Design a protein around this nucleic acid. Sequence first.
RNA 1: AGGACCGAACCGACUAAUGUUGAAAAAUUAGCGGAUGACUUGUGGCUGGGGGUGAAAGGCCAAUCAAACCGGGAGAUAGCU
RNA 2: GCUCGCCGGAAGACCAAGGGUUCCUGUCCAACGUUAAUCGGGGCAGGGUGAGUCGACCCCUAAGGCGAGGCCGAAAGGCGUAGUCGAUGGGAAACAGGUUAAUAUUCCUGUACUUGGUGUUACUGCGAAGGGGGGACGGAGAAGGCUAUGUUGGCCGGGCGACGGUUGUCCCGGUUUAAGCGUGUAGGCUGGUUUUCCAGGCAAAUCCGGAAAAUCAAGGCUGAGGCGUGAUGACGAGGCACUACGGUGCUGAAGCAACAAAUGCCCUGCUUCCAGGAAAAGCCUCUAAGCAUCAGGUAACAUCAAAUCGUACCCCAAACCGACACAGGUGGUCAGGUAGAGAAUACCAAGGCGCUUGAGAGAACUCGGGUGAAGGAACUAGGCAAAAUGGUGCCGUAACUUCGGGAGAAGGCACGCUGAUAUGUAGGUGAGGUCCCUCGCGGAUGGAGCUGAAAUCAGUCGAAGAUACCAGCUGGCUGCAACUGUUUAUUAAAAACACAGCACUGUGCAAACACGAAAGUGGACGUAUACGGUGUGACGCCUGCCCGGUGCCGGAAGGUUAAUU
RNA 3: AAUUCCUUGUCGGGUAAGUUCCGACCUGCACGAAUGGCGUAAUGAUGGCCAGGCUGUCUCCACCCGAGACUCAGUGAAAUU
Lengths: 271, 46
Amino acid sequence: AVVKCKPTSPGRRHVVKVVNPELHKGKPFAPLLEKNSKSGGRNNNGRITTRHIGGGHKQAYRIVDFKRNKDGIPAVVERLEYDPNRSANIALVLYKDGERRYILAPKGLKAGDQIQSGVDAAIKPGNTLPMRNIPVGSTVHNVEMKPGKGGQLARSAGTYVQIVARDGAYVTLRLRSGEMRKVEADCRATLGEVGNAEHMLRVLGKAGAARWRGVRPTVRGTAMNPVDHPHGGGEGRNFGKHPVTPWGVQTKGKKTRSNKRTDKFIVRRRS
Amino acid sequence: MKRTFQPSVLKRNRSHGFRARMATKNGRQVLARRRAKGRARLTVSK
RNA sequence: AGGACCGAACCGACUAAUGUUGAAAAAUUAGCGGAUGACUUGUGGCUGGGGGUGAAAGGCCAAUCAAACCGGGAGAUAGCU
RNA sequence: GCUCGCCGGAAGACCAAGGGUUCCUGUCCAACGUUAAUCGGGGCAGGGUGAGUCGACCCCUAAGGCGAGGCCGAAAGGCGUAGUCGAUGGGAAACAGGUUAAUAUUCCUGUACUUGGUGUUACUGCGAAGGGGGGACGGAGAAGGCUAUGUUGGCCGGGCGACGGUUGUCCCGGUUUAAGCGUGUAGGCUGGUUUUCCAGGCAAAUCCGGAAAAUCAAGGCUGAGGCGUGAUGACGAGGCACUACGGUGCUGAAGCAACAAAUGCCCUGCUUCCAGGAAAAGCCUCUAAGCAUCAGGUAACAUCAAAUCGUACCCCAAACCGACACAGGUGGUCAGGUAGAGAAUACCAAGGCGCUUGAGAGAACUCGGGUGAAGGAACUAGGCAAAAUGGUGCCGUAACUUCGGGAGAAGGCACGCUGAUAUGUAGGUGAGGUCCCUCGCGGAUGGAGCUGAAAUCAGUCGAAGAUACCAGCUGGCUGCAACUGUUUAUUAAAAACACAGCACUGUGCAAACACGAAAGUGGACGUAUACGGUGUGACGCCUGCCCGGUGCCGGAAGGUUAAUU
RNA sequence: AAUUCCUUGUCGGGUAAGUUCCGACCUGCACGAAUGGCGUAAUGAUGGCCAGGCUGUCUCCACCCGAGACUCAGUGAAAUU
């Protein structure tokens, strides 16, 4: 649920929290944990390649099964756990053969629900099937770009993909961005949407909240100096030039897609 | 007032030690120059 | 519960005086700010000069920074002293 | 040697880092020491550092480094796999007393403990570069049970007072004892046991996971402290013989109880929150290939081994970093008494110091302070500085407001000591006794003893009772920025930067983008409720008109237009 | 007006006296709506202004306690020329 903090002090006045009582209030599944060392936005050369990254709370990676290749073995949802590595929640599912795995939690999933994967699986939320068997017009998530590569599209808190048409060996999808893209009609997809739709309603409320996420402060650019940024300085605030990134690219409408290997699978771009 | 030099033997050897100099071609050139000059102490090893 | 309150340690450096061949190449004394946090600190590691890093002052990068230091081109050139 | 003064959350004590003989003894005083010097961290000589248990080494790994082949690159070289290094982290074991001029958990005495090798005896499924478990982990908060430790009483030894009193409800000192072993308590967690089956754990598995039955309710694990033992010992205030008045043999009393109590321990617990909180080995199990009248495994006993290096001394400082015996800087551990909320503050204990020129004088002027007639900001760019306010309880408290605040608003009253209520109350603690019980570190009852606020009434001293140190000046209007934060180390702390929020725009993943001749890496083990860039800057009401210019995004007819031909 | 040159604009408030400050006026030299406009409780070692208290800030300095200054003994610099 969405709850607004009382203004007992500055920094809590505008805080809006998303509290889920159904989430597991305990330690995660140790066998599926892994070490996740922070990088600070620096590559193997030691240089900052992506700015505004650093600090934040320590996190342990959860091995989420994006492939869902366990076919024909029913699984039962044990509990839903908070995942610090992604906006969406995850569910610990116990297969009937005694195996436990982590999967993205769909919208209407809760403890005790039954899920299955394979060609013969039922058309219910949480089930993963190849898009060939998925009825046209269905809502799916964790879509696979290539057969067997694992889900890659629509994995955010409340995102989903709609199957628009099936033309032979390909199916046309409408992504959350509005793009119309086609993929082979053999990729796996999970029914339903991701069930953390309230995630977008949270309000951090204070600067320190962003620092917890590991986001370092952003310096605008119009106020540093001519040497550091094209927007430069000037006596007072001038900014008398076209908006531009560092390194000199416009970025106020200028497009930067230059793949040319894809775009055979792109029907419409967006908007 | 904290000053520039804060001694630490481990860091001293790792930065300017004999093995560190031998680890790279440029470092080996430093030893060659010092040997040619006749330096009594090649590095800060001890 | 809180980038909550008062206030030591701890971290800061707003005012004044002194000092200015100083006790000190930036400190002392009396007050002053934060003091569970975007906090602070030990050890080790990584980023190298038209480059790094920068909650952005052209700040900082060994008391040196609008392009560090050392060696070399080099006895640069100097219609100027 | 006797006084005086200073620090005492250190200006005491013990370490790391760093230094490297500054340690101890003898000797010397040229130089060094801001003076003298017989003295010294100075010169010279000699002597000092003793470990199976402390640390390193060693086993294990983090960030990261290196990196066989490999990929990439004019060369140099870059990146990286298998691997191998890398603590600031994980991993076996020793305590008390005594002792040296200088070392000790290292030597000595006493009493322990750990991991290995080998041997004998008995019983035996052993086996990993594999599987599983464990190791293994956040913030905040709340108590409860304890100890370190302190106070008082009791007990033991001593004392009877330089000046009135002091044989008593008087004064001084002591009242200490470890690891280990045994007990398994306050308290924390988890339902046990047995049988059958199984698409799971790269193969297997009796192990882990999963499923289905039956049977019992008591099983197990973890766990401070206490108690017993260790200990007929050691230590012990003070005696008695030696006694070069430097110090040794021997002997040596009491050695209990109550209360208070941690920031330390139970607690890697419990509760709760979102920002969701290392790895690997040792360790415990599981089997595979293999080996089975063997080898190995378990247990008992015996025996042997536990090497090597560090160990002096300083370590908030005269020994480290600052050229100095320099008002500087420097991480961890220990934490006594009275008052106090307190690690503030004042005075003290243990302990350590008076800071390496002094002696006089008592001018101007400067510095650091005390007081002040009358006036009270007339000073000045400006209340700069100074003065002032200052505590606890109770009463009381405005506009405005985002309903939290504003607020400790403002303002007012009471504070000492003595006695009584009450020979010390409410409360806390809790012995003896009685009873019960699965006869235990148990439960109930019981209230001795000890500890002990706060309040009321009465009395009483002073000019003054929050008397010292300590310890908010307050109120009114207004600009700017929402706020906490950040910044020119060394003249600028701000209205500047960040900021949550908002918007535009790019980005379908081999993403955009960035670092790289490249490989590759970051973005991200993320996937449009995501990520990058740009502007604005909480919140509230809002964000109007203009696309000619420049930019960006589309367009398809025509014109012009490179290499090439 | 952090923006107004003329300028100490004009009027009112506050003062015995107000180039500052506060409230209005609009003749905006040369405000203006995300290089955001206008408000805004709270916050601020932030800018301006006014009060109560307070005082050696001052009228106007006086005395006193310490460290120097001064004298004696020892040691023994510096810039400049």
